[PDB]
Design a protein around this ligand. Sequence first.
Ligand SMILES: O=C(O)/C=C/C(=O)O
Ligand code: SF4
Ligand code: SF4
Lengths: 534, 532
Amino acid sequence: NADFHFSAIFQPTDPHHHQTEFAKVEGSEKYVEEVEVFGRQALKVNPEALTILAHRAFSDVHHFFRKDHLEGWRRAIEDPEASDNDRYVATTLLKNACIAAGRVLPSCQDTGTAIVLGKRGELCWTGGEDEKYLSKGIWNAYRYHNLAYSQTAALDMFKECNTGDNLPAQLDLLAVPGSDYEFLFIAKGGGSANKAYLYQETKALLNPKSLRAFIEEKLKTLGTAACPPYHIALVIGGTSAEMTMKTVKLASCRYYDSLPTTGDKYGRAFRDPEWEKIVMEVAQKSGIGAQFGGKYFAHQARVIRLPRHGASCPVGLAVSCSADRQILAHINKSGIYIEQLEQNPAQYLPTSVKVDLKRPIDKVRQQLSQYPVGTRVMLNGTLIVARDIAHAKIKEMMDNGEPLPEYMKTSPIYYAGPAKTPEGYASGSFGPTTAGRMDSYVDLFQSHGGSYITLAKGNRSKQVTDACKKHGGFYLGSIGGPAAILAKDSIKQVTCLAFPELGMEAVWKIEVEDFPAFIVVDDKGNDMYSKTLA
Amino acid sequence: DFHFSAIFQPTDPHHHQTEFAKVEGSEKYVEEVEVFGRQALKVNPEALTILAHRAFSDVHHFFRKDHLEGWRRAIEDPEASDNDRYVATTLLKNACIAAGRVLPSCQDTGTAIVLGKRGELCWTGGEDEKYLSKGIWNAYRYHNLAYSQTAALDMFKECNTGDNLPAQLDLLAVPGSDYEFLFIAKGGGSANKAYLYQETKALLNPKSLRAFIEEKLKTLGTAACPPYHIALVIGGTSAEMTMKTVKLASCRYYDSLPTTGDKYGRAFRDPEWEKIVMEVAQKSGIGAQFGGKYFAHQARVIRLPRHGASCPVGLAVSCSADRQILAHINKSGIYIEQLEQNPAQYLPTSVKVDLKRPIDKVRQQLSQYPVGTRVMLNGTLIVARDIAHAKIKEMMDNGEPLPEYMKTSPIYYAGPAKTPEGYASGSFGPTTAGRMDSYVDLFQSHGGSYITLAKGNRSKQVTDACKKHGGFYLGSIGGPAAILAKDSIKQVTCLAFPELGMEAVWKIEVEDFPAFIVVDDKGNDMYSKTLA
Ligand SMILES: O=C(O)/C=C/C(=O)O
Ligand code: SF4
Ligand code: SF4
């Protein structure tokens, strides 16, 4: 008991998040009861309060965003240095927030995995069944709202099925001092969750030349498949891999913003605003921008430097996609407090080649070949919808003798999946999905008469541009993210066509009007991303 | 239509299959009480200090049964190569020196990792992290361990903490009144072999997955001191949830999980693919660091639920310094997992090289032998690792010449633990060679680093520099840090950068140092058959 000083790794100057605006659930003070046991102050919390909080959290988060997420779209619209595509995407996204704020449609069709970061106090007593009540609140949120069941169960190593409730949830409940119960609810979409990268580097990385080249290199690997502008988060170091990958996501959700900006002899975590700006240079000098070239590739950056083993240096990269969905909350003696989000997003709000898709496919391919890559396109016609699990069955068909089905050859293939349908609505949120995940099917399906035109979001591999030039194909790129405004304004009629047992991932025929898209990969060999990402 | 199903449903959550020993006189730190009809437990927070102290002390000297049962199996198996028996015997012998409680099992005493599960009605005062850190502080300060943590004064300026703090303190909230623990001393090498891959649906088929495992296992190489406890996790709710699950699988925390999934997407062990990984490991021929069958002790494959668009896969290993201890505090006191106190019950050609000659006279002798030749070094070694190279390259990048100590003796990539009383040195095992690969061609172009001594395979950029500059890379046995200090290392002297802890520059006098020629001056590599 001498030269010992304890210093926690994370020492935030606002641990209880006072800078965040909270709203109180009306009549929630009845779910708590202050008691005194062995001289210490405790809080008997009704476990039903965990169900109600998760319900309101995972409901109101799919319709609203924080200020700094909307302040990044408006900045992308008003900044002169933003490309004409930067303003177009940011306006289309900011408009999608207004349609989503109407509480009828979710902000994105990928309602995301239910993630809960709970911190139960030493003297906060709920009965122990915290997970069951929290899961019931998530179960209530996705069953009684126009959300989507996104979780895939594993019956064995390969046989899979959907759960039908967007469960199970990531329930990481921590033990903390005190008697209060603090939360951070996250609905992390699949695309952003897939752009969480772990690199195991060495001491040779720790110098301003190498680290900058590392950032230049790794930021391009994120690409546009996670619907930029991103909230880029970067963590250098850590006590373990999982501690690094957990810290980078909390940085993306902006949980560690109140951390100090200087380290010490005790190895405390700290934000580095110097290199937060250096990260903003790489993002803005990349020219990748808002999905289609420009300056605003990232809303903002968060860089956290952690302690590390003398032999270890794990670094973590992750982003928060355009569907920035996180909510802070806490339960105390005063009741249930939940973070307020911007209810009115319109206050942040201040040439196209009409393509007919009702013509023969080869007559539509001829029209698209008349224009170079980067051409703004407005689709009007029929689209076939199919994604990963639908593709997995058609290749399984062709691997046994069955031919490529006819519906793949008639209309452009729209890599997407619909959310649940509201009452009196033509469809729920029906935004595009990551294109690069179905890259392995392009050359095969094109060799059998179909998939000549594909419609999705995100850059694709070189194997697709090669397959498109050979078979005379195209890859159309929709605006990734605006799933709500595409459902209300653009999508007019939806009809399940094949594999109805697959839920949202079935084969759908949809009639579409005024669908924004860009020609990024043509039948000649050009790619709109080869300048920014290759 | 709501049914709650937790992701992890272990059939032995409290780890009854693990044998626990009670700290004598620990029942005074607990008191069973009854509050609002439910049973609670007042735990003195000083009990957290004693448990963490005892845990991080006895874990550097003893191992579990299945870790020692894997070395004995590697010695007795007929299909094991003569090198498989040699490494497993040298490691198993190293445990006997370490079981003496004077020397740690490995020079890398590892990062202090604690997975605590405090019950809803387990009361400690809230200072669990402080008291757990004090117990870790006592363990590494009052024992012959090593301070492995590096603080960050800014983005690049660094310094050591001098106490092996901070610790990874992951305290979870669980029902009940008990406080259950898992103490881990994760070494650097095994912690650097934690890999996160973002894969797709196209991976989920027996053809792709088997070849995927074949592909990624080669990346582990021998740089993490095999035989490994290979762990593989397919799926997860997030990257961090996957990387957490794979490490617990490496520490064998999820062994009591079911073996079948259900419509609720519960986690489960896949014994079918646990063997498939063991086939690839045994059919790889990489073996115990130098070719053979026993590349891995055992495998653990866990299949998690996943997003319909996500498929995170996790790869991690537990190195030869497999250090984990389970514990729990209840009304009866402090119970801590028993490790094998007597490891000897699991226990059933060299080119003598003089290193006292001029360096070029020692390089000439090594060129007479092919790769894979067993060598016994006898002479002087210069010790330098990651931070020393970063400072010496900084010297040569500003005008200062390559220092004299780099050019005189073979470069020993290692770092010593603290020295016991009346001892020549503490544990002084080798370190991962691949981390100093970026300095070979530079240092060899300026007259030094012609002979390097470490463990683990290196990149092709080093084999080119060795053939070009006429150099060698000697491969020590990775892991036996205690038996190398007692038997092989006879005299140690700090040479430069004494503020760097283990990563300082050391001059050591060495006798009978086992090593293997893996990279010669011709372009050959003994791992090109197994790892390329
Ligand atoms: O595992 C390593 O390579 C590091 C060993 C050390 O701390 O010297
Ligand atoms: S906005 Fe894009 S990245 Fe985010 S969840 Fe929706 S589709 Fe995925
Ligand atoms: S046994 Fe090898 S990998 Fe494990 S800590 Fe020691 S040196 Fe590192």
